[PDB]
Write a protein that binds this ligand. Structure first.
Ligand SMILES: *[C@@H]1O[C@H](CO)[C@@H](O[C@@H]2O[C@H](CO)[C@@H](O[C@@H]3O[C@H](CO)[C@@H](O)[C@H](O)[C@@H]3O)[C@H](O)[C@H]2NC(C)=O)[C@H](O)[C@H]1NC(C)=O
Lengths: 211, 218
């Protein structure tokens, strides 16, 4: 990295935010600057080129500026959809190469709490016929993005549990999943299995049974 | 209508050569006025410029990678390619085919990014997934479970891409055995089960394998 900038930035909805990138005469000082937006799980998208111009389809809320050896992406009237990673880019005369800044994550303040939607699937008959059993606990649309998952077979099982870290969704909420690997004999030997999802002082438990 | 299509995600063994080919549609790769290049991004990290060829003109390289990269163009097939040699696990990344317009020098702006393709540098062999249906039991959730594959990614569509409202394809879990699993679930009207067929299409390009599974009520 040859450009410097804030690793993360927050603001409220409706406000205006600045994202700065700093360099020197070999890059930002004497060359054109571009800005890119990257939403979760997608390729970057160009927002600003030639330091202050907007491609077609980029709303007027996004602006770009350059002073000295720093460039600035402005976002007036912040929206919940602006939540994203933002990257500045330019040409470096010393390197004779394009260069990127480290990136700035942008989070919009004041998002309401959302309880997780939990769906639990028992093993399918085809998997049982392959002599395996997997219980699948899918957790979506919760905010903030911190959850804990526990499993029960009437009592607490911890072996065979694999759970993902939460990942941001397109609507700015989070999702996670947990799997419980059993043998067919273990699955049929208990009255029920449960997935328990704890989020912000409340728990949601879903139960399945072989019968 | 100018499109870029890469040769897809892949496994590369350590010390071997990472090869990525991008095919251009809707324009000729020889035409001046565009430049074509490569960018990479580690899965939770930042963007790194690799290099770019100005059509009709000069090729430019990240000085940190230049000594093990070759960027080339094949105009007959309207393609351009990246060779990254002597790879190690640090080279695991999303690799993007990229396009820019007008002059590259002093600008370097990318106005069109390809989809991005994960290249995983690992000495473990590829393994295609086993797919199991998650039967449904005013809406119903049904899905399929994609177990025990390597490397990432698996992509899942429903009904050959026709269905995507209510589709949620979850991030993969990395098992302690070093294989991945994921699930994809779609929420559909309950009244639709019995007349509407639901089929998940699970593409594991790294093993050149696709599995389609019809998911029916219990
Ligand atoms: C414009 O900014 C760049 C980026 O900082 C400047 O290049 C950098 O110059 C510094 C200071 O001389 C280099 O310092 C060195 O850091 C490396 C570790 O990266 C260390 O191994 C060396 O012993 C030394 O402390 C730095 O690497 C270098 N970065 C490059 C060349 O990419 C550039 O000098 C600035 N230009 C002007 C006109 O100020």
């Amino acid at each position: 990295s040859v450009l410097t900038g804030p690793p993360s930035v927050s603001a409220g909805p409706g406000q205006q935010v600045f994202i700065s990138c700093s360099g020197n005469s070999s890059n930002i000082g004497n060359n054109y600057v571009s800005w890119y937006q990257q939403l979760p799980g997608t390729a970057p998208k160009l927002l600003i080129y030639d330091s202050n111009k907007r491609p077609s389809g980029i709303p007027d809320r996004f602006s770009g500026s350059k002073s000295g050896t720093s460039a600035t992406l402005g976002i007036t009237g912040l929206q919940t959809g602006d939540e994203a990673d933002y990257y500045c880019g330019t040409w470096d005369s010393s390197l004779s190469a394009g260069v990127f800044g480290g990136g700035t994550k942008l989070t919009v303040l004041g998002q309401p709490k959302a309880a997780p939607s939990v769906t639990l699937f028992p093993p399918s008959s085809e998997e049982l016929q392959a002599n395996k059993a997997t219980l699948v606990c899918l957790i979506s649309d919760f905010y903030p993005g911190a959850v804990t998952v526990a499993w029960k077979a009437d009592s607490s099982p911890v072996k065979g549990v694999e759970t993902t870290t939460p990942s941001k969704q397109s609507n700015n909420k989070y999702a996670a999943s947990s799997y419980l690997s059993l043998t067919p004999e273990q699955w049929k030997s208990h009255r029920s299995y449960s997935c328990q999802v704890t989020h912000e002082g409340s728990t949601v438990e879903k139960t399945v049974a072989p019968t | 209508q100018v499109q870029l299509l890469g040769s897809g995600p892949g496994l590369v063994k350590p010390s071997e050569t990472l090869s990525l080919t991008c095919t251009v549609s809707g324009a000729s790769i020889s035409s001046p006025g565009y430049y074509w290049g490569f960018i990479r991004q580690s899965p939770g990290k930042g963007l790194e410029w690799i290099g770019s060829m100005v059509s009709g003109g000069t090729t430019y390289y990240n000085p940190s990678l230049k000594s093990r990269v070759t960027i080339s163009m094949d105009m007959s097939n309207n393609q351009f390619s990246l060779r990254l040699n002597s790879v190690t696990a640090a080279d695991t990344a999303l690799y993007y085919c990229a396009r820019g317009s007008r002059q590259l020098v002093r600008r370097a702006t990318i106005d069109y990014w390809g989809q991005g393709a994960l290249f995983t540098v690992s000495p473990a062999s590829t393994k295609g997934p086993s797919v199991f249906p998650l039967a449904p039991s005013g809406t119903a959730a049904l899905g399929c479970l994609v177990k025990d594959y390597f490397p990432e990614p698996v992509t899942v569509s429903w009904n050959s891409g026709a269905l995507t409202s209510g589709v949620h394809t979850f991030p993969a879990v990395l098992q302690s055995s070093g294989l991945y699993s994921l699930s994809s679930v779609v929420t559909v009207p309950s009244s639709s089960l019995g007349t509407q067929t639901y089929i998940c299409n699970v593409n594991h390009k790294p093993s050149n394998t696709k599995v389609d599974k019809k998911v029916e009520p219990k």
